[PDB]
């Protein structure tokens, strides 16, 4: 079986919560119910199936082809996306010093400053904050998430993650709204993708795209409809985008070397 | 922005017959319409007079209507879905517990007693139609809730008749030709729903031949030279020898909406805890105002 | 596919009034362990009747799963999803691969007989 | 056009497999290629020279229990019926 | 209890069956249950059988009849792969009339005869994926094996040139077929019809 | 830990020599904390984190396959006392006894290890090359994975005098002192020869009996429960089983090794 991961100092969250973002409530209809519902739904799908011994994130990637497994895959990605989402929306206050952390949160990290500068052509990250809201509002018709995404092109770009798309596997990002007719130009990208992947896995290799996601903002009903409301979908994104613990984002960029 | 897109049975400040909480319908309809009809006005003014169908049927995929189409389809479906209801006779629900294992309880109905039925609502002929078009209303009842359970985002399960009385009737000038269905089928509409047929070639060849007719011009210098469709020779058949046909027979794909059901968190999350979709649909099937569907039922050959 | 490999059988106390359990996947084995309640608790009567009651219980879970399976794709298919190979694709590639061998093989067999008989 | 010994023709009813579509498979099959056998007193057919005509090498010869493969009793009674039929005019 | 433990053993969850591992007989329904193993166990060379499966086996799916036998070996064929055919039935998306489903969709003390779809289908017969199905490609036998299931090829007009084009490689060639439909004869055999698009 | 690294540069597209290090950081750090598979056995386990002798249970054995026996056609009748019944033509072992047998077995190793014991785990079926090596890794014992050179124990001062001997202290610290020709030229007898596939290693079992050396093995429904000091009913075939049993003995050994390396600290 899998185990919904305990949140840092959920002790507060149980009745308290993430300053500004949410008090208790929220995660009650997300981490402590929604997450479990599908975490179990997967654990129930994984039953009797190798897909389980491995973390669902591994499965998320594994369940790429054989679309007949998408059911499990979509849920799987949601499982993965949500924790990434919680991490972004994680208060993750620092400990020690006894006295409650003075939240000297390192804002856009030094590296992040340059990352966006190149990502959006000499533009400010905070500028992107609302640009992001613009994109999300005009890249979703129902459920989904928001996702800053670093690429092998070190353009730390942002992807139009939808419902529960794969923030990594380009062939399954779920960006084009097949429901909403798309301009022939997006179809050009579709044509490319048909060809691009058609030959990548052609030698047993799903496009090895290191499209690593960075900042996740759930756009599922639970994300906004649960509490903030309907027209507040964007408004909910507002406070979230207003402040994001950077400790995680600081460690979401291949910034240094190792072995 | 007038309550034209509404029926009094859907009342403001009304906990939709328990099914929805006092503000449940606000958060699944009234407050939803707020932003919804707002964007509709932002999109255009024909909304004041022309129904959503107009803008929608105005264009399969307008480069501009893109966003407009979404707002249009949503409210249209809301109407088709909310209208066929009548309020299940149960008190406002509690937080369906850690279901999943707690769910799948009783018997996901498969051959175990049907409840609110066309028969129970004196919709006898349609009751037979449903048996004849879905194994048996039991087998029909089975798929409905399940299909909606399948949804993982904002989507709507639908029941139709896909009338195929005969090709050529509008040019034959048959205004009194109340569409005459041949069978009854189920289809779903997510984010923004369209008849169905995965609009196979509805948008396929139209975007497809687009890039491919260009393929020859795309090679601006000449045309990739002798080497022709090649990897796309059999692939141009993507629709040419296939989806062109997959467009259903010979260009006559049309569906007849009768019973439709939303599968958006907003509709169930409200009172049906975090996963009561099934209980939501349970109350739903037990809240279907059939008469409207029999009223929504065209005659058959 | 069934998970015959038994995991720490110790932590497996399972409430079997329902034909589903966390960890244990869906299988005919679940149906069997289910009929036991209906014959132990005696919710139903004899073994034959008991099993059937759960047999229809199983079918439902399987019926819903079948729709769920298609929904993933259909929906994902209608939501920015590209697929490198499908069930039909393995069904053709591997098959066409095999044809490589057979075609070459008959190149010797049929022909060798012409010389073997001419 | 092609020779028989090289082309399986699984009936549609069956389940064809990628290997199944191979020569190996053909060879494999070859390798692994009766009211009396059912349980009727084979002797009772002491006359009916028609039934006994079956398990016969077509040379007035009965078969070793490598072909007939009938039950010891069934085969011995079948053999006795054949021998008795020789006495009973017909066959 | 020792037995209680065994009564729930995965080994016993799998029923016994001594049906030949070659079964030259025409095959319609599967003969044994495939044993799935996580890649981990495969490297650990563990399969849960009485004896470890030889490294020569590199599949993750095998079928076993005898945990172990006099020959001091386990009788297993690593060619258990029905996982593909049935899944392809889902890849084909077509329902079975299943005679008449009185009350229960499959209807029927013991349902030995007319078992039903036979776990080949658990979906509502009617759905809109039908949109003219999805012309699934099949290998024309002359009959056409579609997704491991032979379906009699039908066409508006007989196209000899199409057969001549593939010559003797008619089965080697795969043509998309708008499956007309399939049915499960009480002997658990699926009979279907193809749509040669030629 | 990457000396051969040329951080691409500025415009250079992510160097595919270090792109991987990003996935490495993407692992040990973020990895997959969102959803984590739990309550699941992994072939990785047992050989590394094994049950302490007292923590064992019938279910743990049944899970690890320490029960399935040989066929009801190859049974050395010499174990109607350790057999629990027949199933699917297999003789299931009375694990209740297996537990008592494993309990005692483990005890011998710990006690032996607490006495400078020279354990030499022996196994030859394929796969044990690691489980065994790692087993002796913990108890500072010795191991043999291939076939047992017939004569190792009895004909020692011939088969095994080429190999060298190290003077170890009570904390197993190489004394780093010279061992005289004759001194290093004699017999290094094992004080507890564990066997993991008795069925086909008798040459060692018989030799040890005639070498006055205690043995500990994993008898099956075929091996003879007599050629060994402490028979442990189990399943010789599958390696998860053997690795479970070996594991238990291994940790029993480790605890003793620990307790022994602790008395030395007192002074």
Coordinates of N, CA and C in Angstrom, one line a residue, chain B residues 52-195:
Chain B
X52 N -27.0 30.2 -27.0 CA -25.6 29.7 -27.0 C -25.4 28.8 -28.2
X53 N -26.4 27.9 -28.5 CA -26.3 27.0 -29.6 C -25.9 27.9 -30.8
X54 N -26.5 29.0 -31.0 CA -26.2 29.9 -32.2 C -24.7 30.0 -32.3
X55 N -24.1 30.7 -31.4 CA -22.6 30.9 -31.6 C -21.9 29.5 -31.8
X56 N -22.3 28.5 -31.0 CA -21.7 27.2 -31.1 C -21.9 26.7 -32.5
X57 N -23.1 26.5 -32.9 CA -23.4 25.9 -34.3 C -23.0 26.9 -35.3
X58 N -22.8 28.2 -34.9 CA -22.3 29.2 -35.9 C -21.0 28.7 -36.4
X59 N -20.1 28.0 -35.6 CA -18.8 27.6 -36.1 C -18.3 26.3 -35.4
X60 N -17.9 25.3 -36.1 CA -17.3 24.1 -35.4 C -16.1 24.6 -34.6
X61 N -15.2 25.3 -35.2 CA -14.0 25.8 -34.4 C -13.5 27.1 -35.0
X62 N -14.2 28.2 -34.6 CA -13.8 29.6 -35.0 C -12.5 29.9 -34.3
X63 N -11.5 30.5 -35.0 CA -10.2 30.9 -34.4 C -10.5 31.9 -33.2
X64 N -11.6 32.6 -33.3 CA -12.0 33.6 -32.3 C -12.9 33.0 -31.3
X65 N -13.9 32.3 -31.7 CA -15.0 31.7 -30.8 C -14.3 30.8 -29.8
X66 N -13.1 30.3 -30.1 CA -12.4 29.3 -29.2 C -12.9 29.5 -27.7
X67 N -12.5 30.6 -27.1 CA -12.9 30.8 -25.7 C -14.4 30.9 -25.6
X68 N -15.0 31.7 -26.5 CA -16.5 31.9 -26.5 C -17.1 30.6 -26.5
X69 N -16.7 29.7 -27.4 CA -17.4 28.3 -27.5 C -17.4 27.7 -26.1
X70 N -16.3 27.8 -25.3 CA -16.3 27.1 -24.0 C -17.4 27.7 -23.2
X71 N -17.5 29.0 -23.0 CA -18.5 29.5 -22.1 C -19.9 29.1 -22.6
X72 N -20.0 29.1 -23.9 CA -21.3 28.8 -24.5 C -21.7 27.3 -24.2
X73 N -20.8 26.4 -24.5 CA -21.2 25.0 -24.3 C -21.5 24.7 -22.8
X74 N -20.7 25.3 -21.9 CA -20.9 25.0 -20.4 C -22.3 25.3 -20.0
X75 N -22.8 26.5 -20.2 CA -24.2 26.9 -19.7 C -25.2 26.0 -20.5
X76 N -25.0 25.8 -21.8 CA -26.0 25.0 -22.5 C -26.1 23.6 -21.9
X77 N -25.0 23.0 -21.6 CA -25.1 21.7 -20.9 C -25.8 21.8 -19.6
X78 N -25.4 22.8 -18.8 CA -25.9 23.0 -17.4 C -27.5 23.0 -17.6
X79 N -28.0 23.7 -18.6 CA -29.4 23.7 -18.8 C -29.9 22.3 -19.1
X80 N -29.3 21.6 -20.1 CA -29.8 20.2 -20.4 C -29.7 19.3 -19.2
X81 N -28.7 19.5 -18.4 CA -28.5 18.6 -17.2 C -29.4 19.0 -16.1
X82 N -29.3 20.2 -15.7 CA -30.1 20.6 -14.5 C -31.6 20.5 -14.8
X83 N -32.0 20.7 -16.0 CA -33.5 20.7 -16.3 C -34.1 19.3 -16.1
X84 N -33.5 18.2 -16.6 CA -34.2 16.9 -16.5 C -34.3 16.4 -15.0
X85 N -34.1 17.3 -14.0 CA -34.0 16.8 -12.6 C -35.3 17.2 -11.9
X86 N -35.5 16.7 -10.6 CA -36.7 17.0 -9.9 C -36.4 16.9 -8.4
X87 N -35.2 16.7 -8.0 CA -34.8 16.7 -6.5 C -35.1 15.3 -5.9
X88 N -34.1 14.5 -5.6 CA -34.2 13.2 -4.9 C -34.8 13.5 -3.5
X89 N -35.6 12.6 -3.0 CA -36.3 12.7 -1.7 C -35.3 12.2 -0.6
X90 N -34.2 12.9 -0.4 CA -33.3 12.5 0.7 C -32.7 13.8 1.4
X91 N -32.4 13.7 2.6 CA -32.0 14.9 3.4 C -30.6 15.4 2.9
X92 N -30.2 16.6 3.1 CA -28.8 17.1 2.7 C -27.8 16.0 3.2
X93 N -27.0 15.5 2.3 CA -26.0 14.5 2.6 C -24.9 14.8 3.6
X94 N -24.3 13.7 4.2 CA -23.2 13.9 5.1 C -21.9 13.7 4.3
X95 N -20.7 13.7 5.0 CA -19.4 13.6 4.3 C -19.2 12.1 3.9
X96 N -19.6 11.6 2.8 CA -19.5 10.2 2.5 C -18.1 9.7 3.0
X97 N -18.0 8.8 4.1 CA -16.6 8.5 4.7 C -15.5 8.1 3.7
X98 N -14.4 7.6 4.3 CA -13.3 7.1 3.4 C -13.9 6.0 2.5
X99 N -14.6 6.3 1.5 CA -15.4 5.3 0.6 C -14.4 4.4 -0.1
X100 N -14.3 4.5 -1.4 CA -13.5 3.5 -2.2 C -13.8 2.2 -1.6
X101 N -13.0 1.6 -0.7 CA -13.4 0.3 -0.1 C -14.8 0.5 0.6
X102 N -14.9 1.7 1.3 CA -16.3 2.0 1.8 C -17.3 2.1 0.7
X103 N -16.8 2.6 -0.5 CA -17.7 2.7 -1.7 C -17.7 1.3 -2.3
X104 N -18.3 1.2 -3.5 CA -18.4 -0.1 -4.2 C -19.3 -1.0 -3.3
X105 N -19.9 -0.4 -2.3 CA -20.6 -1.2 -1.2 C -22.0 -1.6 -1.9
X106 N -22.9 -2.1 -1.1 CA -24.2 -2.6 -1.6 C -23.8 -3.3 -2.9
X107 N -24.5 -3.0 -4.0 CA -24.1 -3.6 -5.3 C -24.1 -2.5 -6.3
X108 N -22.9 -2.1 -6.9 CA -23.0 -1.2 -8.0 C -24.1 -1.9 -8.8
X109 N -25.3 -1.3 -8.9 CA -26.4 -2.0 -9.5 C -26.0 -2.7 -10.8
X110 N -26.3 -4.0 -10.9 CA -26.0 -4.7 -12.2 C -27.3 -5.5 -12.6
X111 N -28.0 -6.0 -11.6 CA -29.3 -6.8 -11.8 C -30.0 -6.7 -10.5
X112 N -29.9 -5.6 -9.8 CA -30.5 -5.5 -8.4 C -31.5 -4.3 -8.2
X113 N -32.7 -4.4 -8.7 CA -33.8 -3.4 -8.5 C -33.5 -2.0 -9.0
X114 N -34.3 -1.5 -9.9 CA -34.1 -0.1 -10.4 C -35.1 0.8 -9.6
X115 N -34.7 2.1 -9.5 CA -35.5 3.0 -8.6 C -36.4 4.0 -9.4
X116 N -36.0 5.3 -9.5 CA -36.7 6.3 -10.3 C -36.6 5.9 -11.7
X117 N -37.7 5.4 -12.3 CA -37.6 4.9 -13.7 C -38.6 5.6 -14.7
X118 N -38.4 5.5 -16.0 CA -39.4 6.0 -16.9 C -40.7 5.3 -16.6
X119 N -40.6 4.0 -16.3 CA -41.9 3.2 -15.9 C -42.5 3.9 -14.7
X120 N -41.7 4.1 -13.7 CA -42.3 4.6 -12.4 C -42.9 6.0 -12.7
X121 N -42.3 6.7 -13.7 CA -42.8 8.1 -14.1 C -43.8 7.9 -15.3
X122 N -44.3 6.7 -15.5 CA -45.3 6.6 -16.6 C -44.8 6.9 -18.0
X123 N -43.4 6.9 -18.1 CA -42.8 7.0 -19.4 C -42.6 5.6 -19.9
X124 N -43.6 4.9 -20.2 CA -43.5 3.4 -20.6 C -42.8 3.2 -22.0
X125 N -43.4 3.8 -23.0 CA -42.8 3.5 -24.4 C -41.3 3.8 -24.3
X126 N -40.9 5.0 -23.8 CA -39.4 5.3 -23.7 C -38.7 4.3 -22.8
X127 N -39.4 3.8 -21.8 CA -38.8 2.7 -20.9 C -38.4 1.6 -21.8
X128 N -39.3 1.1 -22.7 CA -39.0 0.1 -23.7 C -37.8 0.5 -24.5
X129 N -37.9 1.8 -25.0 CA -36.8 2.3 -25.9 C -35.5 2.1 -25.2
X130 N -35.5 2.5 -23.9 CA -34.2 2.4 -23.1 C -33.8 1.0 -23.0
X131 N -34.7 0.1 -22.7 CA -34.4 -1.4 -22.7 C -33.8 -1.7 -24.1
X132 N -34.6 -1.4 -25.1 CA -34.2 -1.8 -26.5 C -32.9 -1.2 -26.9
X133 N -32.5 0.0 -26.3 CA -31.3 0.7 -26.8 C -30.1 0.6 -25.8
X134 N -30.4 0.0 -24.6 CA -29.3 -0.2 -23.6 C -29.5 -1.5 -22.9
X135 N -29.4 -2.6 -23.6 CA -29.7 -3.9 -23.0 C -31.0 -3.9 -22.2
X136 N -31.1 -3.2 -21.1 CA -32.3 -3.1 -20.4 C -32.1 -1.9 -19.4
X137 N -33.2 -1.1 -19.1 CA -32.9 0.1 -18.2 C -31.9 -0.3 -17.1
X138 N -32.0 -1.5 -16.6 CA -31.0 -1.9 -15.6 C -29.6 -1.8 -16.2
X139 N -29.4 -2.4 -17.4 CA -28.1 -2.3 -18.1 C -27.9 -0.8 -18.5
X140 N -28.9 -0.1 -18.9 CA -28.8 1.3 -19.2 C -28.4 2.1 -17.9
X141 N -29.1 1.8 -16.8 CA -28.9 2.5 -15.6 C -27.4 2.3 -15.2
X142 N -27.0 1.1 -15.4 CA -25.6 0.7 -15.1 C -24.6 1.7 -15.7
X143 N -24.6 1.8 -17.0 CA -23.5 2.6 -17.7 C -23.6 4.1 -17.2
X144 N -24.8 4.7 -17.1 CA -24.9 6.1 -16.8 C -24.0 6.5 -15.7
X145 N -24.3 6.2 -14.5 CA -23.5 6.6 -13.3 C -22.1 6.2 -13.5
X146 N -21.8 5.0 -14.0 CA -20.4 4.6 -14.2 C -19.6 5.5 -15.1
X147 N -20.2 5.9 -16.2 CA -19.5 6.7 -17.2 C -19.1 8.0 -16.5
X148 N -20.1 8.6 -15.7 CA -19.8 9.9 -15.0 C -18.7 9.6 -14.0
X149 N -18.7 8.4 -13.3 CA -17.7 8.1 -12.4 C -16.3 8.2 -13.1
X150 N -16.3 7.7 -14.3 CA -15.0 7.6 -15.1 C -14.4 9.0 -15.2
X151 N -15.2 10.1 -15.3 CA -14.6 11.4 -15.5 C -13.6 11.8 -14.5
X152 N -12.6 12.5 -14.8 CA -11.5 12.8 -13.9 C -11.4 14.4 -13.9
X153 N -12.2 15.1 -14.6 CA -12.2 16.5 -14.7 C -13.6 17.1 -14.9
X154 N -13.7 18.3 -15.4 CA -15.0 19.0 -15.6 C -15.6 18.4 -16.9
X155 N -16.6 17.4 -16.7 CA -17.1 16.8 -17.9 C -18.6 16.4 -17.7
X156 N -19.3 16.0 -18.8 CA -20.8 15.7 -18.6 C -21.1 14.5 -19.4
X157 N -21.7 13.5 -18.7 CA -22.2 12.3 -19.4 C -23.5 12.6 -20.0
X158 N -23.8 12.0 -21.2 CA -25.0 12.4 -21.9 C -25.8 11.2 -22.4
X159 N -27.1 11.3 -22.7 CA -27.8 10.2 -23.3 C -28.5 10.8 -24.5
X160 N -28.4 10.2 -25.7 CA -28.9 10.8 -26.9 C -29.7 9.8 -27.8
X161 N -30.0 10.1 -29.0 CA -30.7 9.2 -30.0 C -29.9 9.3 -31.3
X162 N -29.0 10.2 -31.5 CA -28.2 10.3 -32.7 C -29.2 9.9 -33.9
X163 N -30.2 10.8 -34.1 CA -31.2 10.4 -35.2 C -30.5 10.3 -36.5
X164 N -30.8 9.2 -37.2 CA -30.3 9.1 -38.6 C -31.5 8.7 -39.5
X165 N -32.6 9.4 -39.3 CA -33.8 9.0 -40.1 C -33.5 8.8 -41.5
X166 N -32.7 9.8 -42.1 CA -32.4 9.7 -43.6 C -31.5 10.9 -43.9
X167 N -30.5 10.7 -44.8 CA -29.7 11.8 -45.3 C -30.6 12.7 -46.3
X168 N -30.3 14.0 -46.4 CA -31.0 14.8 -47.4 C -32.5 15.0 -46.9
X169 N -32.8 16.1 -46.2 CA -34.1 16.4 -45.7 C -34.2 18.0 -45.6
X170 N -33.1 18.6 -45.3 CA -33.1 20.1 -45.2 C -33.2 20.7 -46.6
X171 N -32.5 20.1 -47.5 CA -32.6 20.5 -49.0 C -33.9 20.0 -49.5
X172 N -34.3 18.9 -48.9 CA -35.7 18.3 -49.3 C -36.7 19.2 -48.7
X173 N -36.3 20.2 -47.9 CA -37.3 21.2 -47.3 C -38.3 20.4 -46.4
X174 N -37.8 19.9 -45.3 CA -38.7 19.2 -44.3 C -38.7 20.0 -43.0
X175 N -39.3 21.1 -42.8 CA -39.3 21.9 -41.6 C -40.1 21.2 -40.5
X176 N -41.1 20.5 -40.9 CA -42.0 19.8 -39.9 C -41.4 18.4 -39.6
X177 N -40.2 18.1 -40.2 CA -39.6 16.8 -40.0 C -39.0 16.8 -38.6
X178 N -39.8 16.7 -37.6 CA -39.2 16.5 -36.2 C -38.2 15.4 -36.3
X179 N -37.0 15.7 -36.0 CA -35.9 14.6 -36.2 C -36.4 13.3 -35.7
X180 N -36.2 12.2 -36.5 CA -36.8 10.9 -36.1 C -35.6 10.0 -35.8
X181 N -35.4 9.7 -34.5 CA -34.2 8.9 -34.1 C -34.3 7.4 -34.6
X182 N -33.1 6.8 -34.7 CA -33.1 5.3 -35.1 C -32.7 4.5 -33.9
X183 N -31.8 5.0 -33.0 CA -31.4 4.2 -31.8 C -31.1 5.2 -30.7
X184 N -30.7 4.7 -29.5 CA -30.4 5.6 -28.4 C -29.0 5.3 -27.9
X185 N -28.1 6.3 -27.7 CA -26.7 6.0 -27.3 C -26.3 7.0 -26.2
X186 N -25.1 6.7 -25.6 CA -24.6 7.6 -24.5 C -23.3 8.2 -25.0
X187 N -23.1 9.5 -24.7 CA -21.8 10.2 -25.1 C -21.5 11.1 -24.0
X188 N -20.2 11.6 -23.9 CA -19.9 12.5 -22.8 C -19.3 13.8 -23.3
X189 N -19.4 14.9 -22.5 CA -18.8 16.2 -22.9 C -18.0 16.7 -21.7
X190 N -16.6 16.8 -21.9 CA -15.7 17.4 -20.8 C -15.5 18.9 -21.1
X191 N -14.6 19.5 -20.4 CA -14.4 20.9 -20.5 C -15.4 21.6 -21.4
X192 N -15.3 21.5 -22.7 CA -16.2 22.0 -23.6 C -16.7 21.0 -24.6
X193 N -18.0 20.6 -24.4 CA -18.6 19.5 -25.2 C -19.1 19.9 -26.6
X194 N -18.9 18.9 -27.5 CA -19.5 19.1 -28.9 C -20.3 17.9 -29.2
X195 N -21.2 17.8 -30.2 CA -22.0 16.6 -30.5 C -21.3 15.3 -30.0

